[PDB]
Structure formats: structure tokens, C-alpha cells
Amino acid sequence: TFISRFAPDQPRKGADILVEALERQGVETVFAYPGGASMEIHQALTRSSSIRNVLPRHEQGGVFAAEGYARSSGKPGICIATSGPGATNLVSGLADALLDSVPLVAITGQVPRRMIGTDAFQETPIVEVTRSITKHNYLVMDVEDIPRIIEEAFFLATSGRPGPVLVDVPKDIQQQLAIPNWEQAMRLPGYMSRMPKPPEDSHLEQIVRLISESKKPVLYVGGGCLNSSDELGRFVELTGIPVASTLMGLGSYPCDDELSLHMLGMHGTVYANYAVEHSDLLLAFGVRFDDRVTGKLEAFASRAKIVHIDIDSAEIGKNKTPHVSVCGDVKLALQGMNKVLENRAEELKLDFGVWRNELNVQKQKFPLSFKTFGEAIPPQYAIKVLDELTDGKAIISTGVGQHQMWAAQFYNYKKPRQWLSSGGLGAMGFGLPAAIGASVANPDAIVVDIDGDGSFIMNVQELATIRVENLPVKVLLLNNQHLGMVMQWEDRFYKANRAHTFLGDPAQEDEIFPNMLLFAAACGIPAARVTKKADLREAIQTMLDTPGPYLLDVICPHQEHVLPMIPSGGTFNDVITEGDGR
Ligand SMILES: Cc1cc2nc3c(=O)[nH]c(=O)nc-3n(C[C@H](O)[C@H](O)[C@H](O)COP(=O)(O)OP(=O)(O)OC[C@H]3O[C@@H](n4cnc5c(N)ncnc54)[C@H](O)[C@@H]3O)c2cc1C
Ligand SMILES: Cc1ncc(C[n+]2c([C@@](C)(O)OO)sc(CCOP(=O)(O)OP(=O)(O)O)c2C)c(N)n1
Ligand SMILES: COc1cc(C)nc(NC(=O)NS(=O)(=O)c2ccccc2OCCCl)n1
Ligand SMILES: [Mg+2]
């Protein structure tokens, strides 16, 4: 039974109704940056004794923090911004949450209703701007609609395929007195009638039937399985099918497990891409067949019977036409299939040891490899050390680029929601703010931001947020003085012709620029730099043992290349396995 701070017959400001609507949704943390159009909301937040606000230093940091909060907990992330420039700064985060299907509720202030359309002070049609980069949005036109719209916003953001929902609130609605009706019914008749039903038994029996008839099955696991780690692990026990995971699905099935094929796709392991290439049964659970995974669609699983389970019917058959399809929650599909596999276990006699041995040969002939040049620190090795010293229990957020791939390749994530990374949009500057949101959602957890020097500086202002909020955020900064991923493509396809990919100072060309240690020093964050591989282990240990925030500047040779690499739109026979920028 919820307890209000107001009487059931007492009028209150619309902003106070909005905050209570968040309290009734179980919201404990918001990321709000104040402004003229949202000042009433911020006043109402201070009257709440249960909602904590983490003030960022940039609204993009606010929405990215809301993402990390959501990605690391399953709860919806809530960020608030003012109208105009505050709202437009949320754009990259909204598009990022939509492409990666992250539950998020963004609240933006707006000019009063009578001013909409007049090009008023700090007015942008944020609903028109964000309509194509949000799951849904609203423009509240009456204070009495606040309880209903907030309930619909959280329902849409978290149900079905999760996504971002934006609620635009005019300032006059925030100031108007009203008595909220919390028993309003939601006006989502179409969306609720099309919600996927629990999977039929006839569909699940035919999938188990296809498993016993297959000799080379491969699990194709993605972000849709982040809530099915137990059901998926039970499914792999009953079948013994090797598991190939996407960038978004890392952690659903443990990386250090005997049956793990690790990541597949453009930068996936050779054996994972080999397994999908020569498979006859592809179990696509919670994936969307991204071009970064498939390459040339006609050659992707060209001789496999494809079973696609997805909660979004618009995804089934979008890029790759499956033989069998199940539109529903993969968590329930795994539960129903696990029941069938237990009863008919001895009847089925499932054994893929010949297929597993064929893959284990590829796993030992073509494993993930990296060179060690003198005393220079290999970035892959630094992430390996961080894995050991944290026992693989840390929450990892990354930016975008070479460091992002190495953090996916060389860290053994044991559970889902340890891996917070922008995969669909691939937005730089995601790492640091996402670590902020993950730390607030998991206060007793090890949170490390494996960032690149280009991505880290984009939202470097959030170092102030880390210090003020006293968050134990660790920053493992893999510094190669370059936009490394674009540099790698320059080496491969443009004769190593540098086109504005160097991030240092050409005048002092051999100096580490910028001095990231002084960025942390400006925000009272202890920091250190390591250059030689011998000192790396003690440096990372110092970062972990030092209470509170810490920044570790890890200098890496820039000529490293992420390997292996299937060129964009290529096939498995086009995979690149050797070479760098030397
Ligand atoms: C530089 C860079 C390189 C990259 N290279 C690679 C790469 O080599 N390999 C790679 O895998 N990725 C790579 N990506 C990431 C990438 O572009 C995509 O994000 C990823 O490939 C697609 O993830 P996904 O297939 O799991 O679908 P997601 O984006 O995770 O979406 C989840 C899917 O499952 C469905 N779903 C959601 N919930 C449920 C549920 N409860 N039940 C059933 N279904 C559900 C959704 O409808 C959706 O179709 C790279 C990204 C970057 C930035
Ligand atoms: C807001 C934004 N702007 C430009 C981007 C285009 N990209 C990249 C990519 C892969 O998305 O291109 O497809 S990666 C990248 C450079 C990465 O700099 P780093 O942080 O130092 O990482 P590293 O360890 O050195 O490689 C750029 C410029 C991007 N994604 N986001
Ligand atoms: C790690 O991914 C990266 C990283 C970097 C730095 N640069 C590229 N370069 C291309 O991606 N070139 S592209 O094939 O024309 C292309 C561009 C944009 C979207 C899709 C696409 O593929 C379409 C063919 Cl299916 N890829
Ligand atoms: Mg870099």
C-alpha cells in the first residue's frame, strides 16, 4: 500500500503529481539536469524522500547514465532535462537506447502549452524530433493525463521489446493544481492486443524435434536473453549445443564455460563464425541478425535450418528468413523446451560430441591472439589482468572502438548485465556515464569503465559527477593516442593514410596528449599512468584497492588491430586473421 505525501482530496502541483507517479513506479534514482522549463519538476524532486537525483554535468551524460542504470539492473532508467537545448542533448541517448532495446523513460520540460509553435524561448519540437528514435513519446496536454501517461510510459518502456519513451511536459501543466486519479486505465488497446502470447507446445515440440534430427547445431544468443541466464544454462545442459553470443548477449552464457564459442560476427572468434558457417541448425534466441554479425546475408548460415525466437514480430524474417519461428518471450520458450527435454531425455539421446570436437579443433587452431612488443603494454593483456584481479565479477562499461572490442574479447563475463556497451548505435562517450548509472544501481559492485582516449574525453565532464556523488567508478583508460578503430580501417583499406585520426599534439608528437591524469586531478580523483608491462599488474591492483574513484592511464602501442576481422558485407572465407599497422 503506497503512502502519499499529500491528502487524497488535496490539490497539488502537476510537478508534484509527476514525481509521485514516479514514486508509484518504484523509481529510486533519476538523472535530472535543471532548466527553466523543468524547474517545477526539480522543486518537486526535493520534496520526495525516496527519489535521489544524480545531477550530471551534461544531459548526454544524464541519459547515458540512465542507460547504464537500466542495462546493469533491468529496471527502467529515468533521466530528466529542460526544454530546448537540454532536450536536444538527450537525442544520442534516446537513439542509443532504441537500437539496443534498453528500457528508458526520458522526461523533458516544455514551454507552456499556449506557446507551442511560436518559436518561443528554448522551444524545440522534441516530440517531432524524437518520434523516429523512440519507442513512443507523449506531449502532455492536461494535468489530469499525468498519472495515465507516466504509467503508459513505464509500461511501454519495459514490456515487450524494451525501449525509450519520452514524456514532454509543458511548464504550465507542472504548475497547475489538480487532484490525481491513480486508477485511470491505460489507453493502449492496440499495443496490448498484439502483445506476444506464451509459446504454444506445438511450436516447442517441433523445435526439440529439429534438435534431435540435427548433427551440427549452434546457439545464436543475443541481447534478448539477458533475463534467461538460468533457463539458457539449463537448456545447454540438456542439449550440449555450443553457444555463440552477440556483442549484446555477452554474459547470458558464461564466457569461461567449456561450451562457449565466445562472440561471433565481424570481430567474433574464428571458431564461432566457423560454427555458424557449417551449422545445420541455428537456434537464434533473442537476436536481430545484424549486419555486423551476418555480413553477406546469403552466405550467413547458408546450410542451416534457422529457428528464430524473438519477442518482436517485426524482427522475424526481416533480414534472414527462418524455417521455424516463435514470436514470444525466449525465457518462456526455454522453460517449455526444458520441460520437454527432461521427460523425453532418454527417448531423444542427444549427443553432439562429434560436432563439438570439430569446433574444438578450430578453437585450438585459431584462438584469440595478441603480440607483446618489448615492454609495451598490450591492451588485450591489460583487460586479461583486470579479469583475473576482479575474478570476472566486475561490471564493465566501454566506449566505442578498438578498446570496446578487446573488452568484449578478453573479459569472461559470468552473468548478464555485467556488459554495458553501445552496440546498435555505437556512441562514443557512453563508457564513463554508463559506469555512473551502473554504480548507483549496484553500489557494492566493482564498476570499471574500459574507455578509449577519444571516447573518454567526449564526456570527460562526468568526472565531476563521479566525485560529487562519491561513486567508486574505476576508469581503465586504454590510451593509444588515436581514434583507433578508424585508424585500423585506414591501415586496411586506405593505405594507412591518416585522415584526422590522431588525437595527440603534432607539435609535441611523443608526448601523451591530453594528460588524462590532470582531468581526474581537476575533479579530485586519484589517478596514475602505466607504460611498461611489468608495472601493469600492480597498477590495476592499486586502482581496485584504492577506495572510491580511480583513473588508470594505460599507454598502448597504437599499431594494434582488432582481430579477427570479416570485412563489411563479406563472408567467412574473407576473414582476416593476421596483420596490424606495423
Ligand atoms: C565497433 C563495433 C563492432 C561490432 N561488431 C560486432 C561483432 O563483431 N559481433 C557482434 O555480435 N556485434 C557487433 N557489434 C554490435 C552490433 O552492431 C549489434 O548491437 C549486435 O550485433 C546485435 O545484437 P543482437 O543480435 O543481440 O540484437 P539486440 O540489439 O540485442 O536486440 C535484442 C533482440 O532480441 C529480441 N528480444 C528482446 N527481448 C526478448 C525476449 N524477452 N525474448 C525474446 N526475444 C527478445 C529483440 O526484439 C531484438 O530483436 C559491434 C558494435 C560496434 C560498435
Ligand atoms: C560519437 C561518435 N563519433 C564517431 C564515431 C565513429 N567511430 C567509431 C565507429 C566504430 O563507431 O565507427 O563505425 S570508433 C571511433 C574512434 C574510437 O576512438 P577511441 O575512443 O579512442 O577508441 P579506440 O580504442 O582507440 O579505437 C570513431 C571515431 C562513433 N562510433 N561515435
Ligand atoms: C566495426 O564496423 C566499422 C567500423 C568502422 C570504423 N568503419 C566501418 N566501415 C563500414 O562499415 N563501411 S560499409 O560497409 O560501407 C557500412 C557503413 C555504415 C553502415 C553499414 C555499412 O555496411 C554496409 C555493407 Cl553490409 N565499419
Ligand atoms: Mg583511442
Side-chain angles (χ1 to χ4, degrees):
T1 52
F2 183 81
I3 299 303
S4 172
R5 293 176 280 103
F6 303 84
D9 63 324
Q10 177 187 3
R12 39 189 164 284
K13 288 185 179 181
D16 286 304
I17 299 179
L18 190 147
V19 170
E20 182 171 343
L22 300 176
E23 295 171 338
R24 294 175 177 269
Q25 292 294 330
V27 177
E28 320 174 51
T29 307
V30 306
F31 300 92
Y33 199 94
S38 64
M39 231 182 292
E40 291 282 348
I41 301 179
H42 282 254
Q43 290 291 315
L45 281 174
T46 63
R47 311 187 190 105
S48 175
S49 54
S50 61
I51 296 184
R52 168 197 181 187
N53 180 36
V54 179
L55 169 66
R57 268 55 187 173
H58 194 295
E59 282 94 352
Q60 179 172 98
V63 58
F64 280 162
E67 287 202 57
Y69 187 97
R71 293 165 176 258
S72 73
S73 67
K75 310 166 61 179
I78 295 90
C79 60
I80 308 173
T82 186
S83 64
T88 58
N89 279 341
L90 303 181
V91 163
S92 291
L94 298 175
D96 188 47
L98 178 63
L99 264 50
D100 285 332
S101 307
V102 178
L104 188 142
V105 171
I107 300 174
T108 47
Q110 185 59 275
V111 307
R113 297 174 298 166
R114 67 181 170 277
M115 297 285 96
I116 300 185
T118 75
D119 302 309
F121 179 64
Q122 297 190 338
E123 190 216 343
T124 61
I126 193 62
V127 164
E128 185 70 28
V129 169
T130 61
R131 181 171 295 113
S132 62
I133 53 177
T134 56
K135 179 173 181 178
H136 195 44
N137 55 21
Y138 296 89
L139 177 58
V140 188
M141 287 300 296
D142 192 56
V143 59
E144 296 214 319
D145 292 333
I146 296 182
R148 190 188 98 257
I149 292 180
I150 294 296
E151 183 178 7
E152 295 182 17
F154 276 77
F155 176 74
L156 289 173
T158 65
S159 69
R161 181 175 186 175
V165 178
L166 183 144
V167 173
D168 201 46
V169 185
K171 177 159 183 168
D172 60 325
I173 293 299
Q174 308 172 21
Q175 303 171 336
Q176 185 175 351
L177 291 315
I179 294 146
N181 174 24
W182 306 106
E183 309 296 334
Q184 268 181 289
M186 297 186 301
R187 309 228 210 100
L188 299 168
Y191 175 84
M192 296 195 67
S193 70
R194 314 223 71 78
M195 293 227 60
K197 298 161 181 297
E200 272 258 356
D201 294 310
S202 67
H203 282 97
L204 303 187
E205 302 263 353
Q206 196 196 5
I207 296 178
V208 168
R209 170 187 174 97
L210 268 166
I211 293 183
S212 54
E213 302 176 5
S214 69
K215 296 168 233 306
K216 307 182 169 185
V218 173
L219 269 165
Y220 176 20
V221 171
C225 302
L226 292 191
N227 296 329
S228 310
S229 61
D230 298 338
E231 291 79 2
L232 180 56
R234 186 82 189 98
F235 181 88
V236 183
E237 278 184 344
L238 298 175
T239 65
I241 303 176
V243 185
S245 174
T246 70
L247 196 281
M248 303 303 302
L250 295 181
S252 306
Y253 191 71
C255 273
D256 58 351
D257 196 296
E258 185 191 5
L259 285 157
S260 177
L261 297 172
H262 305 112
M263 194 178 65
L264 88 168
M266 166 172 296
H267 296 296
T269 74
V270 174
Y271 41 97
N273 297 331
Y274 176 90
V276 183
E277 180 73 11
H278 303 278
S279 61
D280 59 2
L281 182 69
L282 187 62
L283 301 188
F285 295 171
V287 297
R288 60 184 178 92
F289 291 79
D290 188 55
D291 54 302
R292 283 298 155 278
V293 176
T294 70
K296 198 172 188 176
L297 274 172
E298 297 79 10
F300 179 77
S302 52
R303 35 194 177 268
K305 286 180 177 177
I306 302 173
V307 173
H308 190 186
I309 297 181
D310 193 303
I311 203 176
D312 188 0
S313 62
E315 292 294 334
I316 307 182
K318 182 180 71 185
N319 303 324
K320 195 68 180 178
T321 307
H323 296 70
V324 174
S325 69
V326 173
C327 184
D329 188 0
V330 71
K331 187 180 183 65
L332 304 185
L334 290 171
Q335 288 178 8
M337 288 188 298
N338 286 349
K339 297 175 183 177
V340 170
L341 292 168
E342 290 199 46
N343 302 328
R344 319 208 301 188
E346 305 181 356
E347 172 187 345
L348 289 162
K349 294 213 66 178
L350 296 172
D351 185 15
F352 309 102
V354 176
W355 173 239
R356 297 188 293 267
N357 207 258
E358 177 178 348
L359 301 181
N360 229 88
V361 168
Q362 300 289 326
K363 191 177 187 300
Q364 292 186 352
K365 276 203 296 180
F366 305 87
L368 293 172
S369 64
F370 64 92
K371 293 183 71 84
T372 299
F373 295 86
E375 274 299 293
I377 300 177
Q380 313 87 342
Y381 179 79
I383 299 172
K384 271 283 195 62
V385 175
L386 181 68
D387 194 340
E388 178 198 347
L389 299 185
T390 57
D391 202 11
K393 307 267 207 60
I395 300 178
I396 298 299
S397 69
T398 70
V400 170
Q402 290 179 320
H403 69 280
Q404 180 191 17
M405 298 296 97
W406 294 322
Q409 294 178 325
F410 297 91
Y411 200 102
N412 293 322
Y413 306 93
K414 302 178 176 179
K415 285 296 181 180
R417 310 200 177 283
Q418 292 187 234
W419 172 242
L420 324 179
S421 194
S422 180
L425 185 67
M428 293 171 57
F430 171 88
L432 192 63
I436 295 180
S439 180
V440 176
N442 310 85
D444 304 326
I446 303 175
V447 183
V448 183
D449 166 43
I450 303 177
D451 225 336
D453 58 317
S455 306
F456 176 80
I457 201 184
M458 278 197 175
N459 287 313
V460 67
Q461 74 277 337
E462 301 310 315
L463 291 177
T465 306
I466 300 182
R467 177 75 279 164
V468 169
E469 304 289 330
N470 284 282
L471 301 175
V473 173
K474 319 295 181 178
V475 191
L476 182 70
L477 183 51
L478 272 48
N479 192 339
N480 57 10
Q481 300 288 278
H482 283 82
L483 300 174
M485 183 67 72
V486 183
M487 175 220 63
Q488 175 170 342
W489 276 68
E490 287 176 334
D491 296 333
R492 286 289 173 177
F493 313 103
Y494 297 98
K495 292 156 172 277
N497 181 72
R498 292 293 172 265
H500 326 103
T501 53
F502 179 61
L503 296 178
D505 191 356
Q508 40 191 358
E509 209 173 50
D510 276 7
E511 290 288 303
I512 298 303
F513 182 87
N515 190 335
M516 304 296 182
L517 308 178
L518 297 180
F519 280 117
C523 300
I525 293 178
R529 181 179 297 175
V530 57
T531 304
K532 299 311 164 187
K533 181 177 173 177
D535 305 328
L536 176 64
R537 186 179 186 87
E538 184 182 348
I540 298 180
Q541 188 70 67
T542 297
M543 177 184 68
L544 301 171
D545 295 336
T546 303
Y550 201 101
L551 162 62
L552 181 52
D553 196 10
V554 178
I555 307 300
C556 306
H558 63 90
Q559 291 92 355
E560 295 290 338
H561 279 199
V562 174
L563 285 174
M565 178 192 189
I566 297 182
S568 189
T571 67
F572 179 71
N573 302 276
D574 300 326
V575 62
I576 299 177
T577 50
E578 305 275 49
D580 58 14
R582 294 174 171 91

